[PDB]
Amino acid sequence: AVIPHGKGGRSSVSGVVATVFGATGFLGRYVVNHLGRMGSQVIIPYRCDVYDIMHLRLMGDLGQLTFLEWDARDKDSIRKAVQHSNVVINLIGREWETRNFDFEDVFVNIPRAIAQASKEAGVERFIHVSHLNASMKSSSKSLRSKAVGEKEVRSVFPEAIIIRPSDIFGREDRFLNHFANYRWFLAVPLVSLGFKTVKQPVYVADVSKGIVNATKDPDAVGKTFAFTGPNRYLLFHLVKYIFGMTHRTFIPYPLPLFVYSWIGKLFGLSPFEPWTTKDKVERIHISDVMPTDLPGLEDLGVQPTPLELKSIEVLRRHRTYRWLSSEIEETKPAKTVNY
Amino acid sequence: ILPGAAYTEKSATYVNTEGRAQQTKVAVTPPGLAREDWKIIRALSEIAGITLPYDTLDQVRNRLEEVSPNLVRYDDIEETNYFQQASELAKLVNQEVLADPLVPPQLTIKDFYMTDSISRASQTMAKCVKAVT
Protein backbone atom coordinates (compact mmCIF):
# COMPACT_ATOMS: atom_id res chain seq x y z
CA ALA A 1 0.00 0.00 0.00
CA VAL A 2 0.97 3.65 -0.13
CA ILE A 3 0.02 5.85 2.81
CA PRO A 4 -1.75 8.84 1.34
CA HIS A 5 0.28 12.02 2.01
CA GLY A 6 -0.19 15.46 0.50
CA LYS A 7 -2.82 18.20 0.28
CA GLY A 8 -4.88 16.55 -2.44
CA GLY A 9 -3.78 18.05 -5.74
CA ARG A 10 -1.16 17.10 -8.27
CA SER A 11 2.30 16.33 -6.93
CA SER A 12 0.58 14.52 -4.04
CA VAL A 13 0.13 10.81 -3.32
CA SER A 14 -3.06 8.76 -2.98
CA GLY A 15 -1.69 5.23 -3.21
CA VAL A 16 -3.71 3.78 -6.05
CA VAL A 17 -1.48 2.07 -8.63
CA ALA A 18 -3.94 1.22 -11.40
CA THR A 19 -3.68 -0.47 -14.78
CA VAL A 20 -6.25 1.01 -17.14
CA PHE A 21 -6.15 -0.85 -20.42
CA GLY A 22 -8.54 1.21 -22.55
CA ALA A 23 -7.59 4.67 -21.30
CA THR A 24 -7.36 6.24 -24.73
CA GLY A 25 -11.14 6.15 -24.84
CA PHE A 26 -13.66 8.93 -24.30
CA LEU A 27 -14.53 7.55 -20.91
CA GLY A 28 -10.95 6.65 -20.33
CA ARG A 29 -9.62 10.11 -20.88
CA TYR A 30 -11.77 11.19 -17.97
CA VAL A 31 -10.78 8.18 -15.74
CA VAL A 32 -7.05 9.05 -16.06
CA ASN A 33 -7.91 12.73 -15.41
CA HIS A 34 -9.30 12.19 -11.91
CA LEU A 35 -6.89 9.38 -11.05
CA GLY A 36 -4.06 11.76 -12.08
CA ARG A 37 -5.59 14.71 -10.30
CA MET A 38 -5.91 12.70 -7.10
CA GLY A 39 -2.22 11.71 -7.39
CA SER A 40 -2.76 7.98 -8.05
CA GLN A 41 -0.13 5.87 -9.85
CA VAL A 42 -1.69 5.17 -13.29
CA ILE A 43 -0.30 2.54 -15.71
CA ILE A 44 -1.88 3.03 -19.14
CA PRO A 45 -1.56 0.07 -21.44
CA TYR A 46 -1.69 1.37 -25.01
CA ARG A 47 -1.56 -0.07 -28.52
CA CYS A 48 -2.06 3.01 -30.67
CA ASP A 49 1.11 4.90 -31.52
CA VAL A 50 2.55 7.28 -28.95
CA TYR A 51 1.28 10.26 -30.90
CA ASP A 52 -2.27 9.51 -29.89
CA ILE A 53 -1.73 9.12 -26.17
CA MET A 54 0.11 12.41 -25.75
CA HIS A 55 -3.18 13.86 -24.58
CA LEU A 56 -2.76 11.77 -21.47
CA ARG A 57 0.72 12.87 -20.57
CA LEU A 58 0.01 16.29 -19.10
CA MET A 59 -2.65 14.66 -16.98
CA GLY A 60 -1.04 13.15 -13.97
CA ASP A 61 2.36 14.12 -12.79
CA LEU A 62 5.87 13.06 -13.59
CA GLY A 63 6.48 9.44 -12.88
CA GLN A 64 2.84 9.09 -12.05
CA LEU A 65 1.72 8.01 -15.49
CA THR A 66 3.49 5.03 -17.10
CA PHE A 67 2.59 3.87 -20.65
CA LEU A 68 2.94 0.18 -21.64
CA GLU A 69 2.96 -1.43 -25.13
CA TRP A 70 0.20 -4.09 -25.12
CA ASP A 71 -1.56 -6.44 -27.57
CA ALA A 72 -4.92 -8.08 -26.72
CA ARG A 73 -4.11 -11.36 -28.55
CA ASP A 74 -0.74 -11.54 -26.73
CA LYS A 75 -1.44 -12.74 -23.15
CA ASP A 76 2.11 -11.77 -22.02
CA SER A 77 1.46 -8.01 -22.52
CA ILE A 78 -1.51 -8.04 -20.07
CA ARG A 79 0.69 -10.08 -17.67
CA LYS A 80 3.40 -7.42 -17.22
CA ALA A 81 0.97 -4.45 -17.14
CA VAL A 82 -0.72 -5.79 -13.94
CA GLN A 83 2.62 -7.05 -12.49
CA HIS A 84 2.86 -4.00 -10.18
CA SER A 85 -0.71 -2.57 -10.19
CA ASN A 86 -3.10 -3.14 -7.23
CA VAL A 87 -6.26 -1.81 -9.01
CA VAL A 88 -7.21 -2.91 -12.58
CA ILE A 89 -9.95 -0.95 -14.45
CA ASN A 90 -11.27 -2.43 -17.75
CA LEU A 91 -12.83 -0.01 -20.28
CA ILE A 92 -12.23 -2.10 -23.42
CA GLY A 93 -15.06 -1.57 -25.87
CA ARG A 94 -16.05 -0.70 -29.43
CA GLU A 95 -19.19 -0.29 -31.46
CA TRP A 96 -17.97 -1.56 -34.78
CA GLU A 97 -16.90 -5.14 -34.93
CA THR A 98 -13.52 -4.72 -36.51
CA ARG A 99 -11.93 -7.10 -38.94
CA ASN A 100 -9.61 -8.55 -36.36
CA PHE A 101 -11.71 -8.08 -33.22
CA ASP A 102 -15.25 -9.29 -32.62
CA PHE A 103 -17.74 -7.94 -30.12
CA GLU A 104 -16.95 -11.00 -28.08
CA ASP A 105 -13.29 -10.11 -28.06
CA VAL A 106 -13.67 -6.48 -27.15
CA PHE A 107 -16.29 -7.16 -24.50
CA VAL A 108 -16.10 -10.72 -23.24
CA ASN A 109 -12.99 -12.49 -24.52
CA ILE A 110 -10.37 -9.84 -23.78
CA PRO A 111 -11.85 -8.40 -20.63
CA ARG A 112 -11.64 -11.91 -19.23
CA ALA A 113 -8.01 -12.65 -19.89
CA ILE A 114 -7.29 -9.29 -18.33
CA ALA A 115 -8.99 -9.86 -14.99
CA GLN A 116 -7.70 -13.40 -15.08
CA ALA A 117 -4.14 -12.19 -15.03
CA SER A 118 -4.98 -9.50 -12.56
CA LYS A 119 -5.88 -12.18 -10.05
CA GLU A 120 -2.68 -14.20 -10.73
CA ALA A 121 -0.98 -10.82 -10.01
CA GLY A 122 -2.93 -10.32 -6.76
CA VAL A 123 -4.58 -6.97 -7.62
CA GLU A 124 -6.83 -5.95 -4.69
CA ARG A 125 -9.82 -5.01 -6.88
CA PHE A 126 -10.86 -5.12 -10.56
CA ILE A 127 -13.49 -2.77 -12.02
CA HIS A 128 -15.22 -4.10 -15.18
CA VAL A 129 -17.43 -1.77 -17.26
CA SER A 130 -20.37 -3.17 -19.31
CA HIS A 131 -23.19 -1.24 -21.09
CA LEU A 132 -26.50 -0.61 -19.23
CA ASN A 133 -29.60 -2.80 -19.84
CA ALA A 134 -27.39 -5.68 -21.05
CA SER A 135 -29.40 -8.85 -21.18
CA MET A 136 -27.82 -12.06 -22.27
CA LYS A 137 -30.72 -11.98 -24.70
CA SER A 138 -30.78 -8.33 -25.69
CA SER A 139 -31.14 -7.73 -29.40
CA SER A 140 -27.86 -5.95 -30.06
CA LYS A 141 -25.07 -8.47 -30.27
CA SER A 142 -23.04 -5.90 -28.43
CA LEU A 143 -25.20 -5.68 -25.37
CA ARG A 144 -25.70 -9.38 -25.18
CA SER A 145 -22.03 -10.11 -25.57
CA LYS A 146 -21.23 -7.60 -22.85
CA ALA A 147 -23.64 -9.39 -20.61
CA VAL A 148 -21.82 -12.59 -21.36
CA GLY A 149 -18.66 -11.00 -20.11
CA GLU A 150 -19.85 -9.62 -16.82
CA LYS A 151 -20.65 -13.20 -15.96
CA GLU A 152 -17.40 -14.80 -17.01
CA VAL A 153 -15.05 -12.26 -15.40
CA ARG A 154 -16.81 -12.99 -12.11
CA SER A 155 -15.46 -16.57 -12.31
CA VAL A 156 -11.94 -15.41 -13.36
CA PHE A 157 -12.11 -12.60 -10.71
CA PRO A 158 -14.70 -13.00 -7.86
CA GLU A 159 -16.04 -9.89 -6.10
CA ALA A 160 -14.93 -7.77 -9.06
CA ILE A 161 -16.99 -4.57 -9.20
CA ILE A 162 -19.10 -4.22 -12.33
CA ILE A 163 -20.23 -0.67 -12.99
CA ARG A 164 -22.76 -0.71 -15.88
CA PRO A 165 -23.09 2.83 -17.37
CA SER A 166 -25.95 4.05 -19.64
CA ASP A 167 -24.98 5.64 -22.99
CA ILE A 168 -22.74 8.50 -21.86
CA PHE A 169 -23.25 12.25 -22.21
CA GLY A 170 -20.05 14.23 -22.65
CA ARG A 171 -17.96 16.25 -25.05
CA GLU A 172 -16.53 13.81 -27.57
CA ASP A 173 -19.33 11.38 -26.76
CA ARG A 174 -21.44 9.73 -29.40
CA PHE A 175 -24.87 9.86 -27.82
CA LEU A 176 -24.93 13.62 -28.04
CA ASN A 177 -22.71 14.31 -31.00
CA HIS A 178 -24.14 11.59 -33.17
CA PHE A 179 -27.58 13.09 -33.18
CA ALA A 180 -26.22 16.60 -33.60
CA ASN A 181 -24.20 15.47 -36.56
CA TYR A 182 -27.33 14.29 -38.34
CA ARG A 183 -27.24 17.82 -39.73
CA TRP A 184 -25.30 16.59 -42.72
CA PHE A 185 -28.25 14.36 -43.33
CA LEU A 186 -31.01 16.63 -44.53
CA ALA A 187 -33.54 14.50 -42.71
CA VAL A 188 -32.95 12.96 -39.31
CA PRO A 189 -34.45 9.48 -39.26
CA LEU A 190 -35.95 8.51 -35.92
CA VAL A 191 -37.43 5.05 -35.42
CA SER A 192 -41.01 5.34 -34.20
CA LEU A 193 -40.47 9.01 -34.89
CA GLY A 194 -38.24 9.07 -31.85
CA PHE A 195 -40.76 7.70 -29.37
CA LYS A 196 -40.93 4.84 -26.90
CA THR A 197 -37.20 4.65 -26.28
CA VAL A 198 -36.94 6.88 -23.26
CA LYS A 199 -33.24 7.48 -22.57
CA GLN A 200 -31.33 8.63 -19.50
CA PRO A 201 -27.97 10.16 -20.26
CA VAL A 202 -25.18 10.50 -17.71
CA TYR A 203 -22.38 13.03 -17.78
CA VAL A 204 -19.02 11.47 -18.50
CA ALA A 205 -17.36 13.03 -15.50
CA ASP A 206 -20.01 11.75 -13.17
CA VAL A 207 -19.25 8.33 -14.55
CA SER A 208 -15.53 8.90 -14.18
CA LYS A 209 -15.70 10.28 -10.69
CA GLY A 210 -17.91 7.40 -9.78
CA ILE A 211 -15.49 4.91 -11.19
CA VAL A 212 -12.59 6.53 -9.41
CA ASN A 213 -14.45 6.60 -6.12
CA ALA A 214 -14.96 2.88 -6.49
CA THR A 215 -11.25 2.37 -6.57
CA LYS A 216 -10.95 4.10 -3.22
CA ASP A 217 -13.86 2.64 -1.26
CA PRO A 218 -14.32 -0.72 0.48
CA ASP A 219 -18.11 -0.62 0.17
CA ALA A 220 -17.98 -1.71 -3.45
CA VAL A 221 -17.23 -5.37 -3.90
CA GLY A 222 -19.18 -7.54 -6.30
CA LYS A 223 -21.34 -4.48 -6.65
CA THR A 224 -22.97 -3.91 -10.01
CA PHE A 225 -23.60 -0.20 -9.86
CA ALA A 226 -25.56 1.65 -12.49
CA PHE A 227 -24.60 5.22 -13.18
CA THR A 228 -27.72 6.54 -14.87
CA GLY A 229 -28.44 10.25 -14.77
CA PRO A 230 -30.45 13.15 -13.37
CA ASN A 231 -33.39 13.01 -15.81
CA ARG A 232 -34.85 10.66 -18.44
CA TYR A 233 -35.99 11.64 -21.93
CA LEU A 234 -38.06 10.42 -24.83
CA LEU A 235 -35.68 10.33 -27.72
CA PHE A 236 -37.77 13.03 -29.38
CA HIS A 237 -36.95 15.89 -27.09
CA LEU A 238 -33.38 14.76 -26.93
CA VAL A 239 -33.01 14.86 -30.65
CA LYS A 240 -34.74 18.16 -31.04
CA TYR A 241 -33.07 19.66 -28.02
CA ILE A 242 -29.74 18.82 -29.48
CA PHE A 243 -30.72 20.36 -32.77
CA GLY A 244 -32.02 23.18 -30.64
CA MET A 245 -28.69 24.05 -29.09
CA THR A 246 -26.98 23.37 -32.37
CA HIS A 247 -29.52 25.78 -33.79
CA ARG A 248 -30.15 23.55 -36.78
CA THR A 249 -33.56 22.62 -38.17
CA PHE A 250 -35.22 19.58 -36.65
CA ILE A 251 -37.13 17.38 -39.07
CA PRO A 252 -38.26 14.25 -37.24
CA TYR A 253 -39.35 11.72 -39.88
CA PRO A 254 -40.13 8.18 -38.81
CA LEU A 255 -38.17 5.36 -40.44
CA PRO A 256 -39.13 1.70 -40.23
CA LEU A 257 -36.30 0.10 -38.29
CA PHE A 258 -36.28 -3.02 -40.42
CA VAL A 259 -35.12 -0.76 -43.21
CA TYR A 260 -32.93 1.31 -40.87
CA SER A 261 -31.02 -1.67 -39.51
CA TRP A 262 -30.08 -1.84 -43.16
CA ILE A 263 -28.77 1.72 -43.20
CA GLY A 264 -26.61 0.82 -40.23
CA LYS A 265 -25.39 -2.13 -42.22
CA LEU A 266 -24.43 0.30 -44.97
CA PHE A 267 -22.23 2.67 -43.02
CA GLY A 268 -21.15 -0.43 -41.13
CA LEU A 269 -19.50 -1.66 -44.30
CA SER A 270 -17.33 1.45 -44.16
CA PRO A 271 -13.66 0.53 -43.75
CA PHE A 272 -12.83 3.58 -41.65
CA GLU A 273 -14.86 3.46 -38.43
CA PRO A 274 -18.45 3.09 -39.65
CA TRP A 275 -20.40 6.07 -38.34
CA THR A 276 -23.56 4.12 -37.54
CA THR A 277 -23.78 0.46 -36.64
CA LYS A 278 -26.45 -2.12 -37.09
CA ASP A 279 -25.65 -2.91 -33.49
CA LYS A 280 -25.72 0.79 -32.78
CA VAL A 281 -29.10 1.37 -34.33
CA GLU A 282 -30.72 -1.23 -32.17
CA ARG A 283 -28.99 0.19 -29.14
CA ILE A 284 -30.22 3.69 -29.87
CA HIS A 285 -33.82 2.55 -30.05
CA ILE A 286 -33.19 0.14 -27.20
CA SER A 287 -35.19 1.66 -24.38
CA ASP A 288 -33.32 2.67 -21.26
CA VAL A 289 -34.04 0.25 -18.45
CA MET A 290 -35.64 1.41 -15.20
CA PRO A 291 -33.68 2.39 -12.09
CA THR A 292 -34.06 -0.34 -9.57
CA ASP A 293 -30.54 -1.54 -8.82
CA LEU A 294 -27.41 -0.97 -6.79
CA PRO A 295 -27.37 2.75 -7.22
CA GLY A 296 -24.38 4.28 -8.92
CA LEU A 297 -23.92 8.00 -8.82
CA GLU A 298 -24.78 9.50 -5.46
CA ASP A 299 -24.52 6.02 -4.09
CA LEU A 300 -20.83 6.13 -4.97
CA GLY A 301 -20.59 9.77 -4.01
CA VAL A 302 -21.22 12.01 -6.99
CA GLN A 303 -24.48 13.82 -7.61
CA PRO A 304 -25.47 13.41 -11.25
CA THR A 305 -25.30 16.48 -13.48
CA PRO A 306 -28.30 17.41 -15.63
CA LEU A 307 -27.80 17.19 -19.39
CA GLU A 308 -28.97 20.68 -20.17
CA LEU A 309 -26.34 22.12 -17.87
CA LYS A 310 -23.30 21.09 -19.88
CA SER A 311 -24.96 20.40 -23.18
CA ILE A 312 -23.96 23.84 -24.34
CA GLU A 313 -20.30 22.87 -24.22
CA VAL A 314 -20.73 19.50 -26.04
CA LEU A 315 -22.96 20.87 -28.87
CA ARG A 316 -21.25 24.29 -29.36
CA ARG A 317 -18.86 23.13 -32.08
CA HIS A 318 -21.85 22.20 -34.24
CA ARG A 319 -23.37 25.69 -34.32
CA THR A 320 -22.68 28.35 -36.92
CA TYR A 321 -21.06 31.71 -36.40
CA ARG A 322 -24.54 33.13 -36.19
CA TRP A 323 -25.39 31.18 -33.11
CA LEU A 324 -22.03 30.80 -31.45
CA SER A 325 -22.68 33.56 -28.92
CA SER A 326 -26.15 32.19 -28.15
CA GLU A 327 -26.46 30.77 -24.65
CA ILE A 328 -28.37 28.07 -22.80
CA GLU A 329 -30.84 30.52 -21.33
CA GLU A 330 -32.00 31.58 -24.78
CA THR A 331 -32.73 27.97 -25.66
CA LYS A 332 -35.49 25.78 -24.25
CA PRO A 333 -35.20 22.61 -22.18
CA ALA A 334 -36.43 19.14 -23.12
CA LYS A 335 -38.98 17.20 -21.12
CA THR A 336 -38.43 14.11 -19.02
CA VAL A 337 -40.53 11.02 -18.88
CA ASN A 338 -40.74 9.19 -15.66
CA TYR A 339 -42.14 6.46 -17.85
CA ILE B 1 -3.57 -0.31 17.20
CA LEU B 2 -4.31 3.43 16.87
CA PRO B 3 -0.85 4.92 15.98
CA GLY B 4 -0.05 8.32 17.42
CA ALA B 5 2.85 10.76 17.20
CA ALA B 6 5.93 11.66 19.23
CA TYR B 7 6.98 14.99 20.72
CA THR B 8 8.90 15.88 17.55
CA GLU B 9 5.57 15.64 15.70
CA LYS B 10 2.90 17.61 17.55
CA SER B 11 2.30 20.96 19.26
CA ALA B 12 1.54 19.32 22.60
CA THR B 13 2.32 20.55 26.11
CA TYR B 14 4.43 18.90 28.80
CA VAL B 15 5.39 20.05 32.28
CA ASN B 16 8.52 19.18 34.21
CA THR B 17 8.87 18.63 37.95
CA GLU B 18 8.41 22.10 39.39
CA GLY B 19 5.34 22.58 37.22
CA ARG B 20 6.73 24.76 34.44
CA ALA B 21 4.49 23.95 31.50
CA GLN B 22 6.26 23.93 28.15
CA GLN B 23 5.26 23.65 24.49
CA THR B 24 6.70 21.14 21.96
CA LYS B 25 6.39 22.47 18.40
CA VAL B 26 5.90 20.32 15.31
CA ALA B 27 9.36 19.76 13.82
CA VAL B 28 8.23 17.04 11.38
CA THR B 29 4.68 16.03 10.27
CA PRO B 30 3.65 12.68 11.90
CA PRO B 31 4.45 9.60 9.70
CA GLY B 32 2.15 7.22 7.77
CA LEU B 33 -1.56 7.48 8.60
CA ALA B 34 -0.38 8.15 12.18
CA ARG B 35 -2.21 11.15 13.77
CA GLU B 36 -1.86 13.59 16.76
CA ASP B 37 -2.85 11.89 20.06
CA TRP B 38 -5.57 14.43 21.00
CA LYS B 39 -7.43 14.07 17.67
CA ILE B 40 -7.49 10.23 17.67
CA ILE B 41 -9.46 10.54 20.98
CA ARG B 42 -11.66 13.45 19.76
CA ALA B 43 -12.44 11.32 16.65
CA LEU B 44 -13.10 8.07 18.58
CA SER B 45 -15.52 10.16 20.68
CA GLU B 46 -17.38 11.38 17.59
CA ILE B 47 -17.63 7.79 16.44
CA ALA B 48 -19.02 6.98 19.84
CA GLY B 49 -21.61 9.68 20.43
CA ILE B 50 -20.06 11.41 23.45
CA THR B 51 -18.08 13.83 21.43
CA LEU B 52 -15.48 15.90 23.18
CA PRO B 53 -16.26 19.61 22.80
CA TYR B 54 -12.82 20.57 21.48
CA ASP B 55 -12.11 20.39 17.77
CA THR B 56 -9.05 22.57 17.31
CA LEU B 57 -5.95 22.55 19.44
CA ASP B 58 -6.52 26.02 20.77
CA GLN B 59 -9.75 24.56 22.09
CA VAL B 60 -8.19 21.52 23.69
CA ARG B 61 -5.98 24.02 25.42
CA ASN B 62 -8.85 26.24 26.64
CA ARG B 63 -10.06 22.86 28.04
CA LEU B 64 -6.76 22.36 29.90
CA GLU B 65 -7.36 25.83 31.43
CA GLU B 66 -10.66 24.77 33.09
CA VAL B 67 -9.19 21.59 34.67
CA SER B 68 -5.75 23.13 35.49
CA PRO B 69 -3.82 26.47 35.46
CA ASN B 70 -0.24 25.59 34.71
CA LEU B 71 -1.16 23.94 31.38
CA VAL B 72 -2.08 27.25 29.64
CA ARG B 73 0.61 29.64 31.08
CA TYR B 74 3.98 28.53 29.65
CA ASP B 75 7.46 29.05 31.17
CA ASP B 76 5.74 30.10 34.45
CA ILE B 77 6.50 28.23 37.73
CA GLU B 78 3.61 28.43 40.26
CA GLU B 79 4.95 30.23 43.39
CA THR B 80 2.55 29.50 46.31
CA ASN B 81 2.03 25.98 47.75
CA TYR B 82 0.21 24.69 50.87
CA PHE B 83 2.75 22.47 52.69
CA GLN B 84 1.17 23.03 56.14
CA GLN B 85 -2.20 21.34 55.37
CA ALA B 86 -0.32 18.58 53.47
CA SER B 87 1.48 17.72 56.70
CA GLU B 88 -1.74 17.58 58.72
CA LEU B 89 -3.06 14.80 56.42
CA ALA B 90 0.40 13.13 56.44
CA LYS B 91 0.14 13.07 60.27
CA LEU B 92 -3.28 11.33 59.97
CA VAL B 93 -1.75 8.67 57.63
CA ASN B 94 -0.07 5.76 59.55
CA GLN B 95 2.22 3.43 57.55
CA GLU B 96 5.31 1.24 58.14
CA VAL B 97 8.57 1.91 56.24
CA LEU B 98 9.90 -1.64 55.60
CA ALA B 99 13.60 -2.26 56.45
CA ASP B 100 14.42 -3.11 52.80
CA PRO B 101 16.87 -0.52 51.57
CA LEU B 102 15.40 2.00 49.09
CA VAL B 103 17.36 1.51 45.82
CA PRO B 104 17.26 3.61 42.59
CA PRO B 105 16.54 1.32 39.58
CA GLN B 106 19.28 3.06 37.49
CA LEU B 107 22.23 1.81 39.62
CA THR B 108 24.91 2.38 36.92
CA ILE B 109 24.86 4.05 33.45
CA LYS B 110 23.88 1.00 31.33
CA ASP B 111 20.71 1.21 33.49
CA PHE B 112 20.25 4.77 32.15
CA TYR B 113 20.66 4.47 28.36
CA MET B 114 17.49 2.48 27.59
CA THR B 115 14.33 3.35 29.50
CA ASP B 116 11.41 4.76 27.49
CA SER B 117 10.07 3.60 24.16
CA ILE B 118 12.05 5.89 21.91
CA SER B 119 15.16 5.12 23.89
CA ARG B 120 14.60 1.41 23.66
CA ALA B 121 14.13 1.70 19.95
CA SER B 122 17.50 3.43 19.57
CA GLN B 123 20.27 1.77 17.55
CA THR B 124 22.65 4.40 18.98
CA MET B 125 21.47 3.62 22.54
CA ALA B 126 21.82 -0.11 21.76
CA LYS B 127 25.42 0.46 20.54
CA CYS B 128 26.04 2.44 23.77
CA VAL B 129 24.53 -0.42 25.87
CA LYS B 130 26.83 -3.12 24.38
CA ALA B 131 29.86 -0.77 24.69
CA VAL B 132 29.19 -0.63 28.48
CA THR B 133 28.57 -4.43 28.52
Partner: protein, 118 residues
Protein backbone atom coordinates in the same frame (compact mmCIF):
# COMPACT_ATOMS: atom_id res chain seq x y z
CA UNK C 1 -9.44 66.09 8.06
CA UNK C 2 -8.77 62.72 9.63
CA UNK C 3 -11.46 60.20 10.40
CA UNK C 4 -11.75 57.99 13.50
CA UNK C 5 -11.62 54.20 13.55
CA UNK C 6 -11.22 52.02 16.61
CA UNK C 7 -11.12 48.94 14.44
CA UNK C 8 -7.85 47.08 14.79
CA UNK C 9 -6.26 47.51 11.40
CA UNK C 10 -7.18 44.21 9.96
CA UNK C 11 -6.39 44.16 6.30
CA UNK C 12 -6.89 40.45 5.91
CA UNK C 13 -9.27 41.39 3.17
CA UNK C 14 -6.65 43.14 1.07
CA UNK C 15 -3.58 40.96 1.57
CA UNK C 16 -4.92 38.37 -0.85
CA UNK C 17 -4.30 35.21 1.19
CA UNK C 18 -6.47 32.06 0.64
CA UNK C 19 -9.05 31.70 3.47
CA UNK C 20 -7.57 28.38 4.68
CA UNK C 21 -4.12 29.89 5.38
CA UNK C 22 -5.41 32.83 7.42
CA UNK C 23 -7.59 30.95 9.84
CA UNK C 24 -5.63 27.75 10.32
CA UNK C 25 -2.12 29.15 10.53
CA UNK C 26 -0.53 29.90 13.85
CA UNK C 27 2.67 31.93 13.73
CA UNK C 28 5.08 32.12 16.70
CA UNK C 29 7.05 35.34 17.44
CA UNK C 30 10.39 34.22 18.94
CA UNK C 31 14.00 35.50 19.10
CA UNK C 32 16.13 32.73 17.53
CA UNK C 33 18.41 30.89 19.97
CA UNK C 34 22.01 30.07 19.16
CA UNK C 35 22.86 26.65 17.82
CA UNK C 36 25.10 25.55 20.56
CA UNK C 37 27.70 24.70 17.97
CA UNK C 38 28.89 28.29 17.62
CA UNK C 39 29.43 30.91 20.31
CA UNK C 40 28.46 33.90 18.24
CA UNK C 41 25.40 35.84 19.29
CA UNK C 42 24.65 37.86 16.16
CA UNK C 43 21.76 35.60 15.22
CA UNK C 44 20.02 35.98 18.55
CA UNK C 45 19.40 39.68 18.12
CA UNK C 46 16.33 40.33 15.95
CA UNK C 47 12.84 38.85 16.70
CA UNK C 48 11.41 36.58 13.96
CA UNK C 49 7.81 35.31 13.59
CA UNK C 50 7.56 31.89 11.87
CA UNK C 51 4.37 30.20 10.56
CA UNK C 52 3.45 26.72 11.93
CA UNK C 53 5.18 23.75 10.16
CA UNK C 54 3.03 21.58 7.78
CA UNK C 55 3.15 18.32 5.68
CA UNK C 56 6.47 17.31 4.05
CA UNK C 57 5.63 14.00 2.26
CA UNK C 58 8.31 12.10 0.25
CA UNK C 59 7.97 12.40 -3.58
CA UNK C 60 7.48 8.99 -5.28
CA UNK C 61 9.58 9.54 -8.48
CA UNK C 62 12.78 11.00 -6.95
CA UNK C 63 12.34 10.85 -3.14
CA UNK C 64 12.68 14.66 -2.83
CA UNK C 65 10.72 16.27 0.05
CA UNK C 66 7.42 17.82 -1.18
CA UNK C 67 5.32 20.45 0.67
CA UNK C 68 1.72 21.68 0.12
CA UNK C 69 2.05 24.64 2.54
CA UNK C 70 2.93 27.98 0.86
CA UNK C 71 3.71 29.96 4.08
CA UNK C 72 6.26 27.36 5.28
CA UNK C 73 9.58 28.82 4.21
CA UNK C 74 8.51 32.32 5.08
CA UNK C 75 10.07 33.78 8.13
CA UNK C 76 9.68 37.52 8.52
CA UNK C 77 12.13 39.42 10.68
CA UNK C 78 10.91 42.19 13.00
CA UNK C 79 13.22 44.39 15.16
CA UNK C 80 10.94 44.63 18.24
CA UNK C 81 8.28 42.44 19.92
CA UNK C 82 5.63 45.20 19.65
CA UNK C 83 6.03 45.56 15.84
CA UNK C 84 5.86 41.78 15.20
CA UNK C 85 2.63 41.49 17.27
CA UNK C 86 1.18 44.29 15.12
CA UNK C 87 1.92 42.35 11.91
CA UNK C 88 -0.01 39.32 13.19
CA UNK C 89 -3.07 41.39 14.22
CA UNK C 90 -3.57 43.31 10.93
CA UNK C 91 -2.79 40.22 8.77
CA UNK C 92 -5.17 38.17 11.00
CA UNK C 93 -2.74 35.30 11.75
CA UNK C 94 -2.90 33.92 15.35
CA UNK C 95 0.24 34.68 17.41
CA UNK C 96 1.84 33.23 20.59
CA UNK C 97 4.82 35.49 21.55
CA UNK C 98 7.74 33.92 23.50
CA UNK C 99 9.66 36.34 25.79
CA UNK C 100 13.32 36.83 24.87
CA UNK C 101 15.54 34.89 27.23
CA UNK C 102 19.00 36.38 27.49
CA UNK C 103 21.91 34.77 29.32
CA UNK C 104 22.00 35.97 32.91
CA UNK C 105 25.14 37.73 34.05
CA UNK C 106 27.74 35.27 35.29
CA UNK C 107 30.60 36.21 37.59
CA UNK C 108 33.98 34.98 36.43
CA UNK C 109 37.52 35.63 37.64
CA UNK C 110 40.69 33.71 36.80
CA UNK C 111 41.81 33.85 40.42
CA UNK C 112 39.08 31.51 41.60
CA UNK C 113 40.51 28.51 39.84
CA UNK C 114 43.49 28.68 42.16
CA UNK C 115 41.41 28.76 45.31
CA UNK C 116 42.83 27.48 48.57
CA UNK C 117 39.60 25.58 49.21
CA UNK C 118 36.98 25.64 46.38
Amino acid sequence: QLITVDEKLDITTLTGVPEEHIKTRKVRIFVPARNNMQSGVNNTKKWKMEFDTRERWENPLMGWASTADPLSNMVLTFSAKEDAIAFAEKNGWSYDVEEKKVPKPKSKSYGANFSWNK
